[PDB]
Design a protein around this ligand. Sequence first.
Ligand SMILES: NC(=O)c1ccc[n+]([C@@H]2O[C@H](COP(=O)([O-])OP(=O)(O)OC[C@H]3O[C@@H](n4cnc5c(N)ncnc54)[C@H](OP(=O)(O)O)[C@@H]3O)[C@@H](O)[C@H]2O)c1
Ligand SMILES: Nc1nc(=O)c2nc(CNc3ccc(C(=O)N[C@@H](CCC(=O)O)C(=O)O)cc3)cnc2[nH]1
Length: 159
Amino acid sequence: MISLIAALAVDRVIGMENAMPWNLPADLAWFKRNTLDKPVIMGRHTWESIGRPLPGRKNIILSSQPGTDDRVTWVKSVDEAIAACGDVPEIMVIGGGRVYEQFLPKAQKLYLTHIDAEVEGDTHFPDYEPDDWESVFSEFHDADAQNSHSYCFEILERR
Ligand SMILES: NC(=O)c1ccc[n+]([C@@H]2O[C@H](COP(=O)([O-])OP(=O)(O)OC[C@H]3O[C@@H](n4cnc5c(N)ncnc54)[C@H](OP(=O)(O)O)[C@@H]3O)[C@@H](O)[C@H]2O)c1
Ligand SMILES: Nc1nc(=O)c2nc(CNc3ccc(C(=O)N[C@@H](CCC(=O)O)C(=O)O)cc3)cnc2[nH]1
């Protein structure tokens, strides 16, 4: 299983200036829950934006050029990234935009957080489509103290 996980604001915006500007702790907790113990594949820009390894997960970074940090695994292409994950049930792809574009045709599951927020955005989630996917999970939550915007968690299976 190749799965993508992403948090999208309105108009499918996922980032700006190579950052996530919004602070939504409930969604981070959901991200950790759904990636714990799994391999995670990310692009080099996302690597520099998170800034650090992610604990309890095998961190795989796509980059066309020599890696600079042996606390993670560097790979030069998509199939190399897949091979490096070994024999895991579920391979999590955690972005960013250019990497999501390449892995979407090979994914069978999408973990999406739809955030009710407008964010001027430098990068977007790939434009998917009304008919390749059906929902297996809905969980909507209003804004509270720690979380300033409402958000929907959705899991989608490739039909
Ligand atoms: N809302 C969310 O859930 C979410 C999730 C993740 C990221 N983000 C945001 O997304 C933005 C970053 O996304 P991005 O599209 O600019 O970059 P990205 O996808 O994270 O990384 C692009 C880089 O990854 C490498 N790469 C991609 N495909 C490759 C391939 N087939 N082979 C070898 N290397 C490959 C290349 O590294 P080299 O250039 O070194 O060759 C490429 O420059 C940030 O704003 C981040 O905060 C948001
Ligand atoms: N749903 C979703 N939300 C996101 O914010 C998200 N972010 C990325 C890329 N950026 C990041 C940035 C920070 C952390 C992070 O610090 N996570 C900690 C949280 C620990 C905790 O919740 O206490 C982690 O260990 O997962 C993860 C991904 C990729 N997919 C996503 N997917």
